[PDB]
């Protein structure tokens, strides 16, 4: 099917400020369905936010946002909007968009979801990651990686060899440095033989900063 949902308009936002999340509908027209926003604070659970009703434009709000958020839809643009004013820290989340399916088929279930846009209410300013190389050693497979240090806000993305190296790769979840910044590291394992002949580059992208870094990871120099 072509049925798709595309969120956009999230990111770092100061407390007290405003955003407007957009949701772009592809495989279906939103005018015949009910459309709902659902958020999820990091590593917390799903929280229902607002919804609007087909044929009536009736809007219903979670009470934790009532009077600070407003839901809406433009039929023509087959888009649904979400205006978030006077945001606070706890508004931080991935904000998902979902289609309540057609009653005859899926009852009141939410049968298609977007990939969600991440909203990051804080005053601390954006910084991009210094990227350092985790060099391998002796003792038939060894491991090498990259250290993605002291960035903010989430997310960064790591790929190896421009995505050509996918197998054996573990990009750890960021942890929160006491600087408030993020650090994380990615690691791949490879048979020791490839060391001298195989170029190994990690690719690090932190869009909030517009930072793209490519760090060639080579063995011990001596």
């Amino acid at each position: 099917s072509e049925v798709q949902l595309v969120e956009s308009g999230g990111g770092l936002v100061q407390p007290g400020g405003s955003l407007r999340l957009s949701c772009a509908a592809s495989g279906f027209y939103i005018s015949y369905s009910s459309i709902h926003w659902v958020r999820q604070a990091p590593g917390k659970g799903l929280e229902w936010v607002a919804s609007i009703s087909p044929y009536s434009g009736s809007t219903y709000y979670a009470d934790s946002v009532k009077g600070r958020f407003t839901i809406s839809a433009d039929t023509s643009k087959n888009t649904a909007y979400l205006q978030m004013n006077s945001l606070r820290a706890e508004d931080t989340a991935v904000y998902y968009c979902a289609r309540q399916g057609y009653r005859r088929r899926s009852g009141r279930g939410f049968d298609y979801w977007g990939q969600g846009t991440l909203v990051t209410v804080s005053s601390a300013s954006t910084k991009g990651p210094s990227v350092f190389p985790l060099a391998p050693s002796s003792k038939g497979t060894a491991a090498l990686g990259c250290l993605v240090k002291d960035y903010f806000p989430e997310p960064v993305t790591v790929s190896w060899n421009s995505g050509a190296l996918t197998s054996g790769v573990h990009t750890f979840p960021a942890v929160l440095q006491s600087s408030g910044l993020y650090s994380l590291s990615s690691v791949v394992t490879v048979p020791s033989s490839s060391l001298g002949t195989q170029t190994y580059i990690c690719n690090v992208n932190h869009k909030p900063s517009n930072t793209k870094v490519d760090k060639k990871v080579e063995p011990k120099s001596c």
Binding site: H36, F110, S130, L147
Partner: protein, 215 residues
């Protein structure tokens, strides 16, 4: 007043091919306006059951919903490894809509000892005055592990941080990255940096280590 969805357990470890029952209890009658979702890390939710008992198009038959009064129960007759997921109930019988706090499921496999490596801080880093030592515990299970940093045989404390991967749904295992962090000055004070792993698969605590400077 808000209908509450109170779902238990918070978490569930089980074997492949077990039966797993997740329960949700609506604070008020919600008829059968209950639906069940499967959410795997970083992915958006997926629909499983929609009229408390009705299997969504394409969902495996091993899943099934059920109402009994205001008690709703999802039920996987036999776990497959892929079924690793946090599961949520939702009530859509009134407004505001409401979700359960969700139930994180885990695979279960035989024991796998951690592969262990240790990484000395990169030369670029030390120039900028920072010094991170990284220790890696690879592809092990069960995840409960104890990492201990010793600097010149001094157990460290409060200067390490670790993060853990989810269960590789194909592997059903875990990986961990414990990172010791110091000022360049504190780093240059000690020769030996050692990372002491204790795990059930290891009959003896494995230590990888290095000396500052060795090529």
């Amino acid at each position: 007043s808000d209908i509450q969805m109170t779902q238990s357990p918070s978490s569930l470890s089980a074997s492949v091919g077990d039966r797993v029952t997740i329960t949700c209890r609506a604070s008020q009658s919600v008829s059968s306006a209950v639906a069940w979702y499967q959410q795997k890390p970083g992915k958006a939710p997926k629909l499983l059951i929609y009229s408390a008992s009705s299997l969504y198009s394409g969902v495996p038959s091993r899943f099934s919903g059920s109402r009994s009064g205001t008690d709703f129960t999802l039920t996987i007759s036999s776990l497959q490894p892929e079924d690793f997921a946090t599961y949520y109930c939702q009530q859509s019988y009134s407004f505001p809509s409401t979700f359960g706090q969700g139930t994180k499921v885990e695979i279960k496999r035989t024991v796998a000892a951690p592969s262990v490596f240790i990484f000395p801080p990169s030369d670029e880093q030390l120039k900028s005055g920072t010094a991170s030592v990284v220790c890696l515990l690879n592809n092990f299970y069960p995840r409960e592990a104890k990492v201990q940093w010793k600097v010149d045989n001094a157990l460290q404390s409060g200067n390490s941080q670790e993060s853990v991967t989810e269960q590789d749904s194909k592997d059903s295992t875990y990986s961990l990255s414990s990172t010791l962090t110091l000022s360049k000055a504190d780093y240059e004070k000690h020769k030996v940096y050692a990372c002491e792993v204790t795990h059930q698969g290891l009959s003896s605590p494995v230590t990888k280590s290095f000396n500052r400077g060795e090529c």
